[PDB]
Amino acid sequence: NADYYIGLDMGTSSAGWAVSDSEYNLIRRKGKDLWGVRQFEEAKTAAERRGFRVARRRKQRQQVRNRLLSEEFQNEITKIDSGFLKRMEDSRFVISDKRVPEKYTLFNDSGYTDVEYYNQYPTIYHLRKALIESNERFDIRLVFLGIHSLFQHPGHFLDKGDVDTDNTGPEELIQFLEDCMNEIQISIPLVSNQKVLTDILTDSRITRRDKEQQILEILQSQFVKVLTGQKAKLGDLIMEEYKYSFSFREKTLEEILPDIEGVYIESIYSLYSWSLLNSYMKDTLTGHYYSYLAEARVAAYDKHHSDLVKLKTLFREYIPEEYDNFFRKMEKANYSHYIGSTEYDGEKRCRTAKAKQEDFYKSINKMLEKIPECSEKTEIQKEIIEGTFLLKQTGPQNGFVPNQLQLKELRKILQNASKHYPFLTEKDERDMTAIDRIEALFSFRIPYYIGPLKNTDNQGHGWAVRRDGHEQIPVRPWNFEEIIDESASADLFIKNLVNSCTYLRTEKVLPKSSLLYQEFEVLNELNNLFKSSLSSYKKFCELFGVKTLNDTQKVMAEQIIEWSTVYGDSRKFLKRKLEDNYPELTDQQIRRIAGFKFSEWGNLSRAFLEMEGYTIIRALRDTQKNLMQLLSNDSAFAKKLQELNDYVTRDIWSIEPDDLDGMYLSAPVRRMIWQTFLILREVVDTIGYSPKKIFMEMQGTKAIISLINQCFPDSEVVYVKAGNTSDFRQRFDIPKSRDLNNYHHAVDAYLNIVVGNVYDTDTTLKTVKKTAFKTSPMVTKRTYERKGGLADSVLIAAKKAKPGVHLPVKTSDSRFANQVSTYGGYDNVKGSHFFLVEHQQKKKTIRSIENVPIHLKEKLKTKEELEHYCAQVLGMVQPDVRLTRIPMYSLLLIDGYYYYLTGRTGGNLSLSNAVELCLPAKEQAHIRMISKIAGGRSTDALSAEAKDDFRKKNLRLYDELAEKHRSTIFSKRKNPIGPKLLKYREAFVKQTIENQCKVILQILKLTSTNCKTSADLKLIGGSGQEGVMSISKLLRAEKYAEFYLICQSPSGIYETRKNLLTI
DNA sequence: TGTGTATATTGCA
RNA sequence: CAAGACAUAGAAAUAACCUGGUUUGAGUGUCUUGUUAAUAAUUAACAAGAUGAGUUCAAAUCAGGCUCCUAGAGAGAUCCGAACUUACCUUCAUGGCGGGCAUUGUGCCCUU
DNA sequence: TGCAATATACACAGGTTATTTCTATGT
């Protein structure tokens, strides 16, 4: 009949919608005004979820490496201690919960135990120093332990250098760099200023650029502009534009060895290599440097010891009564809290969370104040400012340690053991000894383009290409090149990220430098008639010799463009592809191919460009053609498109589950669009026909107008300029009080229908004004099942953990699931949804609303499953599940007041206000103006007689807001506020303007549906968390006069009240 | 942020 | 003078890494007096006084799922598991969710 | 002598490399 309109105000946390005819005056359906505010939560991005996924895979890989490393030492360790590998696995458990009841974690011999092992080696670095320096035959368990600790702390893999160097001081290798004097003679001042040259380049805190400028002032390309880390020009390497620029940070000389072949020759690597390894290993007492990182930590261990005796003497000499509170006692950020353990008065060790030195340093500064100034006090205060006082080896500050620095200790420890344990040098079928495998395991990490090495089910992101006959074979560092087709899988990694075709949907686009795609741009410009060019042909005819490309070298040429784009840089792939497939090209030909680099992709695919309409690429050639009429309905090429992809537009009207995937939409936008569809799908069907127009307002909107244009094609979607609606609120006096209620979202959607259809194209104003101030809009909240973490991410202390309330470490392990107060557990166990169960408590039939935990959601879907859960776990007598799913934030009507079932509070149910406050339109402007003063704007620069008006207007509002909480719907809440609002009335007058306007907004937090109901009415004398309402878990029929559950559809058109006291 | 949740305080008959 | 050469900055998705952190356990605490105990003096228990140490390691790190067993505080695999989707009712259908007035306080009328 | 209604405290995070989409600038 009469076509209607739909306006939308779509936002990341709420979607407002409105329905109107050609003359506003909202359409009426099911006896309701057809507008409302669909509210929900902002959708979480996948970045956090990806954080745990990669962390899980990293933990999985670290567990395999620990397993494989243990199998290398498995046979030799068994000869002395069979259970050593299993003793380490039994570490968390108390002596009564481990497989073998042995007290100590690692060593359980007669002479040697954990107490004796730490007397010889107080720290792991002390063990490693013995493992490296000493040539005595060590116990294989100690050798394994030293190697194992390096595996736990491998260091970063960012620095590309040659650990393989045996040993060479900076004085020695500089002499080699003096050689090759074919330069402008900068290589000799390498020896002259070597003392300043070595330390300045080694210094790890000097900025690399500032380090670069100062050194050349004494050495006066140059290679002195590359030590920072950047591309290096080959202008001076005995023969500019032939850069093949290598940056020492990005690529290894061995990797660039084929690149530099056929051309200050190679030793310039060593000086840069020296800087990376020895930057952080500089001795302070002397001028030299340590050899291995273990040697640098025993020295740091001894400085911390020397720092401790200074603090102990200072405290005992000056404040001996405060000595006991800082060292032999656990408090906030004292020394014991810093170390994380304490042992005094013969009591057991009190191991807790460790303190950060920032708060620990602050604790000494406040603690030295009561000591009069002296030499030691100034000296200790000096070190704290420098940050070198009482340092610990492990912590967030060890992000500098590279793998090559740790690889040096691995080789030295393994080499020192080969002279004593022959099992490390027994070769095998691959001619690899144990050392060749441990060293390979240590430094080998999967390259970023391989991804996960297995796809048990095709549900993950894995794309690795296993070679034929190598499936279901574990990948090792030595098996990596055989099992995994590294070139083929790296092709997929780039390919999967490539965009899809603009018109066709199943084929990836072609490179923008590909031959046929380079054409499509030029004939597009030919029709327009230059901003485009056809240059790949101009470029590729040099390689092939022939000036004009035939049809047998064009397919030759296009495979190179794809390879030079998919395999950009990383010449081990491009060169391998050419050499094996096409051995015809010579060395200069291959090197010239790497010379040009294109890595951009077009908007269209190869399959689309060669479609048999009656090839579209030739269609732009023979005729002049129109830019968009070629693929429009007026032509036969459009029909050819639909046959290639059987997918239909809009999918199905009633089925559009996840059509938003692949459109590069953030998770907040995807949820915000989807709930918009849940409304329109429910309005166009409740009404008979489809809306003539759709108005919307939130540049990614172009991706949004499109996918909705699929829905209801006959509609005329209109986008209204942002800020146009706010102009209507100004000139036509329609204030928007965002802090009052959520009705503005509906009005914003409603006004969207007004600015539109008038910007594009009586008493019209009166109808809009009357509608704009209506209380009609139906505000719904998206009910859902809570997703995310099952509980808190980290375990809490066993002292703070109690059974039943805290999720154990492992539920399937009876050791953890039964001793939550012994091993700790996960706090705040999140629940998915709620369900209603009727049980007999105190020999009386009552009902309670219990929750289904997120970790039990899948096995608790049926009523029989839920009843069994109540009987055994919840402990209910004769359970009878009446409702199986009460979602989170479900509407409840309790004693006439509407709430939201947000969560739970121990034995209670947390509720939030679901009722909208409605103040008269005159006080809407004052609240909007109150927020700005509380939001930062100052009342000091105000008229002396406009400020007494401020107090009185504020007084009237507080007096009015004291009435809605007294005699209105807002008087039926739990924990009422009206009695308390009058109680603090004398403190509302007796306060400044700013403070008495920061409580008005806090009061308004008690009648807002967007936030949890609570108020910071502490300025007027109440509490910072005031007004929280929380009913009991049990629905006693005598306590509540009524208790419903309003199940509303997303538009709210269909409601269903389920009396929780009956059904 | 903001909030779900355990935890704590406060009357109170 | 718009490309480009680049730089830098941010967002999104994915992959590969590091430092940790957290929890539990290990890293033997020792002396003095007093009280009360077992039994001339000791060994505990407890309380109050003191006192010396301290830097690390091991294992787990969403619950869990997956393969195989010949069912275990078992092996395997090293990847699935914190993002996105769901009102309610049914034969799970392009089904249903009665017909209408109000719209500042959660109502009213006609029907089943 | 609990006990219901109110009010309170608080939570894993800081870096790195690479790719592909997508902007922002000056340079």
CATH of residue A33: 3.30.420.10
Signed CA dihedral, A332, A336, A339, A344: sign only? negative
Hey, which residues does A9 pair with through a beta bridge? A16
Which nucleotide, over all strands, has the C1' atom closest to the CA of A48? C82
**Burial readout A845-867 (b: 16 or more C-beta within 10 A, e: otherwise):** ebbbbbbbbbbbbeebeeeeebb
Question: What is the stated resolution of the deposited model, in angstroms?
Answer: 2.9
CA-closest candidate to residue A674, choices A661, A685, A684: A661
Considering the domain boundaries, does residue A465 fall inside one? no
Task: Characterize the bridge pairing of strands A1043-1048 and A1034-1035.
Answer: unpaired
A1024 CB and strand D closer than 7 A: yes
The DSSP annotation for A993-1020 comes to HHHHHTTHHHHHGGG-SSS-S-B-TTTT
- Measure, in angstroms, how far nucleotide C83 C1' is from residue A673 CA: 16
A36 shares a domain with A57: no
Separation between Cα atoms, residue A788 and residue A942, nearest integer Å: 49
A309 shares a domain with A248: no
Separation between Cα atoms, residue A881 and residue A874, nearest integer Å: 13
CA-closest candidate to residue A371, choices A321, A416, A337: A321
Protein residue minimizing CA–C1' distance to C50: A345
* Method by which this entry was solved: cryo-EM
A601 CB and strand D closer than 7 A: yes
Separation between Cα atoms, residue A253 and residue A1058, nearest integer Å: 74
A648 CB and strand C closer than 7 A: no
- Residue type present at position A1056: T
Q: Strand C and chain A: which residues 86-145 have CB closer than 7 Å? A: 88-89, 91-94, 97-99, 103-106, 114-115, 118-119, 122-124, 145
What H or E segment, with its residue span, contains residue A7?
strand A5-10
- Measure, in angstroms, how far nucleotide C112 C1' is from residue A1032 CA: 37
Contact A1044, A893 (CB under 8 A): yes
- Measure, in angstroms, how far nucleotide D24 C1' is from residue A665 CA: 19
Separation between Cα atoms, residue A486 and residue A576, nearest integer Å: 11
A1063 CB-contact burial (10 Å; exposed 0-12 / middle 13-18 / buried 19+)? exposed
A950 shares a domain with A1024: yes
Region class of A753: left (phi > 0), else alpha (psi between -120 and 50), else beta: alpha
Separation between Cα atoms, residue A513 and residue A598, nearest integer Å: 7
- Measure, in angstroms, how far nucleotide D9 C1' is from residue A376 CA: 40
Mention every residue, 6+ apart, whose C-beta is less than 8 A from residue A408: A163, A277, A291, A292, A293
Measured between its terminal Cα atoms, the distance across chain A in Å is: 41
- Measure, in angstroms, how far nucleotide D20 C1' is from residue A603 CA: 14
A199 shares a domain with A76: no
Tokens, residue A827: 């706090």
Contact A352, A337 (CB under 8 A): yes
Task: Characterize the bridge pairing of strands A1034-1035 and A844-853.
Answer: antiparallel
Separation between Cα atoms, residue A932 and residue A923, nearest integer Å: 15
- Measure, in angstroms, how far nucleotide B9 C1' is from residue A928 CA: 36
CA A868 to the chain's CA centroid: 38
CA-closest candidate to residue A166, choices A264, A270, A272, A266: A270
DSSP class of A969? G
CA-closest candidate to residue A165, choices A513, A432, A408, A464: A408
Taking each helix axis from N to C end, the angle separating A268-278 and A170-178, rounded to the nearest 10 degrees, works out to: 160
Residue A831: helix, strand or coil by DSSP? strand
Contact A1029, A1012 (CB under 8 A): no
* Positions in chain C where some atom is under 7 Å from a protein CB: 2-3, 6-7, 11-31, 49-66, 73-74, 76-88, 94, 96-107
Number of folded domains that form chain A: 7
CA-closest candidate to residue A831, choices A803, A860, A852: A852
Q: Which CA distances in Å does A288 have to A193, A302, A763?
A: 16, 18, 91
A36 shares a domain with A152: no
Separation between Cα atoms, residue A280 and residue A285, nearest integer Å: 15
Contact A278, A374 (CB under 8 A): no
Hey, which residues does A718 pair with through a beta bridge? A695
A566 shares a domain with A695: no
A806 shares a domain with A686: no
- Residue A735: count other Cβ atoms within 10 Å of its Cβ: 19
CA-closest candidate to residue A620, choices A519, A531, A548: A519
A137 shares a domain with A58: yes
Q: Which CA distances in Å does A832 have to A213, A850, A853?
A: 61, 11, 5
Considering the domain boundaries, does residue A106 fall inside one? yes
Residue A341: helix, strand or coil by DSSP? coil
**Cα–Cα–Cα angle for A332, A334, A339, nearest 5°?**
110
Q: Strand D and chain A: which residues 137-156 have CB closer than 7 Å? A: 156
- Residue type present at position A739: D
A903 CB and strand D closer than 7 A: no
Judge whether A9 counts as a catalytic residue: yes
Considering the domain boundaries, does residue A774 fall inside one? yes
Separation between Cα atoms, residue A632 and residue A7, nearest integer Å: 30
The residue segments making up the domain with residue A596 are 498-644
Contact A154, A444 (CB under 8 A): no
Q: Which CA distances in Å does A547 have to A538, A542, A550, A553?
A: 9, 7, 9, 12
Region class of A31: left (phi > 0), else alpha (psi between -120 and 50), else beta: left
Which nucleotide, over all strands, has the C1' atom closest to the CA of A496? D20
CA-closest candidate to residue A463, choices A485, A482, A500, A489: A489
Which residue, chain included where needed, has tokens 């310039």? Answer: A268
Q: Which domain-ending residue is among A386, A410, A430? A: A386
Separation between Cα atoms, residue A363 and residue A322, nearest integer Å: 12
Separation between Cα atoms, residue A749 and residue A76, nearest integer Å: 75
Separation between Cα atoms, residue A232 and residue A229, nearest integer Å: 9
- Residue A1041: count other Cβ atoms within 10 Å of its Cβ: 11
- Residue A1: count other Cβ atoms within 10 Å of its Cβ: 7
Separation between Cα atoms, residue A626 and residue A632, nearest integer Å: 10
| Rounded CA Rg of chain A | 37
CA A703 to the chain's CA centroid: 25
Contact A965, A977 (CB under 8 A): yes
Residue spans of beta strands (DSSP E) within A680-761: 693-696, 716-719
* Positions in chain D where some atom is under 7 Å from a protein CB: 4-9, 11-22, 24
Residue spans of beta strands (DSSP E) within A255-388: none
Residue A508: helix, strand or coil by DSSP? strand
Separation between Cα atoms, residue A973 and residue A1031, nearest integer Å: 10
- Residue A508: count other Cβ atoms within 10 Å of its Cβ: 16
A340 CB and strand C closer than 7 A: yes
Region class of A662: left (phi > 0), else alpha (psi between -120 and 50), else beta: left
Considering the domain boundaries, does residue A849 fall inside one? no
- Measure, in angstroms, how far nucleotide C104 C1' is from residue A833 CA: 34
CA-closest candidate to residue A993, choices A1045, A943, A954, A1033: A954
Considering the domain boundaries, does residue A134 fall inside one? yes
**Cα–Cα–Cα angle for A511, A512, A518, nearest 5°?**
115
Residue A282: helix, strand or coil by DSSP? strand
Contact A584, A578 (CB under 8 A): no
Which residue, chain included where needed, has tokens 């050639």? Answer: A621
Q: Strand D and chain A: which residues 372-401 have CB closer than 7 Å? A: 396, 399
The DSSP annotation for A83-113 comes to THHHHHHS-SS-TTTSSS--SSSS-BSSS-B
- Measure, in angstroms, how far nucleotide D7 C1' is from residue A1021 CA: 14
- Measure, in angstroms, how far nucleotide C93 C1' is from residue A901 CA: 33
Contact A503, A644 (CB under 8 A): no
- Residue A966: count other Cβ atoms within 10 Å of its Cβ: 15
Q: Which domain-ending residue is among A743, A760, A781? A: A781
Which residue, chain included where needed, has tokens 């397919």? Answer: A555
Considering the domain boundaries, does residue A680 fall inside one? yes
A245 shares a domain with A229: yes
Mention every residue, 6+ apart, whose C-beta is less than 8 A from residue A978: A962, A963, A964, A965, A966, A970, A971
Separation between Cα atoms, residue A867 and residue A837, nearest integer Å: 8
Contact A748, A936 (CB under 8 A): no
A761 CB and strand D closer than 7 A: no
Separation between Cα atoms, residue A652 and residue A280, nearest integer Å: 63
A45 CB and strand C closer than 7 A: yes
Mention every residue, 6+ apart, whose C-beta is less than 8 A from residue A381: A365, A368
- Residue type present at position A699: Q
Separation between Cα atoms, residue A425 and residue A417, nearest integer Å: 10
Residue A908: helix, strand or coil by DSSP? strand
Sequence-distant contacts of A138-144: CB under 8 A, at least 24 apart: A138/A416, A138/A417, A138/A420, A139/A80, A140/A73, A140/A76, A140/A77, A140/A80, A140/A417, A140/A421, A141/A77, A141/A80, A141/A81, A141/A84, A141/A106, A141/A107, A143/A73, A143/A413, A143/A417, A143/A421, A144/A70, A144/A73, A144/A77
Task: Characterize the bridge pairing of strands A35-39 and A693-696.
Answer: unpaired
Taking each helix axis from N to C end, the angle separating A403-418 and A293-318, rounded to the nearest 10 degrees, works out to: 110
Q: Which CA distances in Å does A383 have to A304, A357, A391, A610, A949?
A: 12, 13, 11, 73, 58
Signed CA dihedral, A527, A532, A538, A540: sign only? negative
Tokens, residue A59: 């933990």
A602 shares a domain with A522: yes
A614 CB and strand D closer than 7 A: no
Residue A250: helix, strand or coil by DSSP? coil
A274 shares a domain with A174: yes
Protein residue minimizing CA–C1' distance to B6: A906
Separation between Cα atoms, residue A196 and residue A180, nearest integer Å: 22
**Cα–Cα–Cα angle for A348, A354, A358, nearest 5°?**
140
Sequence-distant contacts of A447-453: CB under 8 A, at least 24 apart: A447/A486, A447/A490, A448/A493, A449/A489, A449/A490, A449/A493, A449/A494, A450/A484, A450/A486, A450/A489, A450/A490, A450/A493, A451/A489, A451/A493, A452/A57, A453/A484
**Burial readout A878-916 (b: 16 or more C-beta within 10 A, e: otherwise):** ebebebbbbbbbbbbbbeebbbbbbbbeeeebbbbbbbb
A44 CB and strand C closer than 7 A: yes
Contact A900, A891 (CB under 8 A): yes
Residue A827: helix, strand or coil by DSSP? coil
What H or E segment, with its residue span, contains residue A746?
helix A743-755
A73 shares a domain with A16: no
User: What is the number of helices (H) and of strands (E) in chain A?
Assistant: 43, 23
A1023 CB and strand D closer than 7 A: yes
Considering the domain boundaries, does residue A823 fall inside one? yes
Considering the domain boundaries, does residue A490 fall inside one? no
Tokens, residue A237: 């390497």
Active-site entry in A9, A33, A159, A739: A9
